[PDB]
């Protein structure tokens, strides 16, 4: 009754191969958005029907042999956007290759695409109400953690007073539970009305709380706020609010959601009975995970070259290389178990691990350095390399 109607969400997961040396920015929604706009050329209606999820973020320097995965979400009834999208995307061979396409809900590959599965509103209500039934003790805090997709743009009480770039939320204190629920209702009602008593009721039924926030401001060379917070649930909440939460997990919240901004994910409390609803956490995930990038051979050779300066090696090196290769096999097998530390005198006594595990750690640091450096440069808690000497004094 909260939403008397809604469009039928549908999705595609596209996995594509790289045949060239390509480098992205830290957030990838702009490049993929421009790709679909220069490819499809739909005009205005692309704003009304489509949205983009890019699982890969924070990986700057790609390479040949590395894949890429992203999700396109479509709304409406009897649309043919997916048909022309399929026909144009099949021949996309260079740069960009193509590995595969997979339907978002059924999971079967793109073939036999006469009709795709429809995330009907009743299914959203079911996947919310059954979750409520299987998670209600009426004396539980029901904490679930909320992770952003690195950007969202909302207005704190829709303040006209501040009048500019300051009008957006940029810290924890501006996060108001009623404000978030009001913005969610605004977006859902906009999408419903494209194709009142209610806004009063949602003012009374706010029981939720924001705990231990870590949110900050990132300015894309635009603006947005990124981070996580523990959203906590009091027992008096009804499944109707949960339905809005789960649908807005895909539709989005905030200004300019057409460019893919303003989506999130939520990881419920552990040890629950396995109930996966709406979007599956194993589908919207980086195609080549970070650990595979750790075990790629040239990075490991780079790490070996980096660490050997203060190595103080005393044993045979062929066994070290056989050990790192065997540990690479174990990591690929997902069975590795780290050695415990050992305390060596240098004078002072220092506790270090065996050198091959040190090599693996240096390899992980080499992989992680560029993304973290780019996120420290583009954020509020940023080092300032070029210091204004008068300003610093």
Helix (H, G, I), strand (E, B) or coil at 95: coil
Longest CA–CA separation in the chain, Å: 78
The rounded distance, in Å, linking the Cα atoms of 367 and 318 is 25
* Tokens 């079911």 belong to residue: 126
Instruction: List the determination method.
Output: cryo-EM
Helix (H) or strand (E) holding 371: helix 355-377
Residue found under tokens 């290389």: 321
Bridge partners of 216, per DSSP, are 226
CA atoms within 13 A on the CB side of 153: 17
- Cα–Cα distances (Å) from 22 to 19, 61, 65, 66, 373, in that order, read 9, 7, 11, 10, 19
Phi, psi of 84 (to 5 degrees): -70, -30
Of 32, 33, 41, the C-alpha closest to 96 is 32
Q: How many CB atoms lie within 10 A of CB 140?
A: 13
Tell me if 210 sits within 8 A of 167, measured CB to CB: no
Non-local CB neighbours of 1 within 8 Å, separated by 6+ positions: 240
The residue written with tokens 């069975």 in the block is 335
Q: Are strands 209-218 and 224-232 parallel, antiparallel or unpaired?
A: antiparallel
The DSSP call for residue 114 is S
Query: In this structure, which long-range contacts are made by residues 337-343, counting pairs with CB atoms below 8 Å and at least 24 apart in sequence?
Result: none
| Lateral strand order in the sheet of 264-267 | 209-218, 224-232, 144-148, 264-267
Ranges assigned E (strand) in 94-196: 100-103, 144-148
Q: Which two tokens stand for residue 107?
A: 């999971």
The CB-side HSE value for 122 (13 A sphere, CA atoms) comes to 1
- Per-residue tokens: 46: 């692309």
- Up-side HSE of residue 386: CA atoms within 13 Å toward CB? 0
- Strand segments (E) across 29-108: 50-53, 67-74, 100-103
In 3D, which of 233, 235, 206 has the Cα closest to residue 137? 235
Q: How far is CA 229 from CA 19, 117, 232, 334, in A?
A: 39, 33, 9, 30
- Tell the burial category of 277 from Cβ atoms under 10 Å away from its Cβ (0-12, 13-18, 19+): middle
Residue burial 216-246, b: 16+ Cβ < 10 Å; e: rest? ebbeeeeebbbbbbebbbeeebebbbbbbbb
Return the SS3 of 359.
helix
For the beta carbon of residue 53, count every other beta carbon within 10 angstroms: 23
Rounded-to-integer distance, Cα 225 and Cα 265, Å:
15
C-alpha–C-alpha distance, residues 375 and 382, integer Å: 8
User: Hey, CA dihedral for 257, 197, 121, 87, is it positive or negative?
Assistant: negative
Are 47 and 258 a contacting pair, CB within 8 Å? yes
Instruction: Locate 292 and state its tokens.
Output: 């595979």
R_g of the chain computed on alpha carbons: 24
Distance CA 250, CA 187 (A): 11
144 touches 233 (CB < 8 A): yes
Q: How far apart are CA 195 and CA 381, in angstroms?
A: 43
- Total residues belonging to the chain: 393
């Amino acid at each position: 009754m909260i939403l008397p109607s809604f469009p039928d969400l549908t999705g595609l997961v596209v996995n594509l191969k790289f045949t060239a040396r390509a480098e992205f920015s830290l957030n990838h929604e702009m490049a993929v958005d421009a790709f679909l706009r220069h490819s499809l050329n739909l005009g205005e209606s692309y704003s009304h029907h489509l949205s983009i999820i890019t699982p890969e973020n924070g990986r700057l320097f790609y390479r040949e042999g590395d894949t890429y995965r992203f999700v396109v979400i479509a709304m409406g009834n009897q649309q043919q956007t997916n048909s022309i999208w399929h026909t144009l995307i099949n021949h996309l061979r260079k740069n960009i290759k193509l590995e595969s396409l997979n339907d978002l809900f059924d999971g079967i590959p793109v073939s036999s695409k006469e009709s795709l599965d429809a995330y009907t509103l009743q299914r959203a209500m079911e996947q919310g109400l059954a979750w409520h039934k299987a998670a209600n003790l009426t004396e539980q805090p029901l904490d679930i953690q909320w992770y952003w997709q690195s950007t969202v743009r909302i207005l704190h009480a829709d303040h006209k007073q501040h009048k500019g770039e300051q009008r957006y939320c940029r810290d924890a204190v501006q996060l108001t539970p009623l404000l978030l629920l009001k913005r969610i209702y605004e977006t859902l009602n906009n999408v419903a009305t494209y194709f009142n008593h209610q806004a009063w009721l949602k003012e009374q039924a706010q029981y939720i709380e924001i705990q231990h926030p870590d949110l900050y401001w990132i300015d894309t060379p635009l603006g947005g706020m990124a981070g996580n917070f523990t959203l906590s649930l009091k027992p008096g909440i009804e499944p109707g609010l949960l339905a809005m939460l789960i649908l807005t997990q895909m539709v989005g919240v905030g200004q300019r959601r057409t460019s893919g901004l303003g989506k999130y994910w939520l990881k419920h409390s552990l040890k629950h009975a396995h109930l996966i609803l709406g979007l599956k956490p194993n589908r919207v995930t980086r195609s080549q995970t970070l650990l595979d990038c750790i075990i790629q051979p040239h990075i490991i050779s780079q790490a070996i070259a980096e660490i050997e300066k203060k190595t103080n090696i005393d044993t045979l090196n062929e066994r070290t290389l056989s050990q790192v290769q065997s540990a690479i096999g174990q990591l690929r097998k997902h069975q590795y178990q780290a050695p415990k530390l050992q305390g060596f005198t240098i004078e002072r006594l220092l506790a270090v691990s065996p050198l091959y595990d040190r090599i693996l750690q240096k390899a992980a640091a080499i992989v992680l350095t560029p993304g973290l450096d780019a996120i420290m440069s583009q954020a509020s808690y940023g080092y300032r390399k070029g210091l204004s000497r008068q300003q610093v004094r």
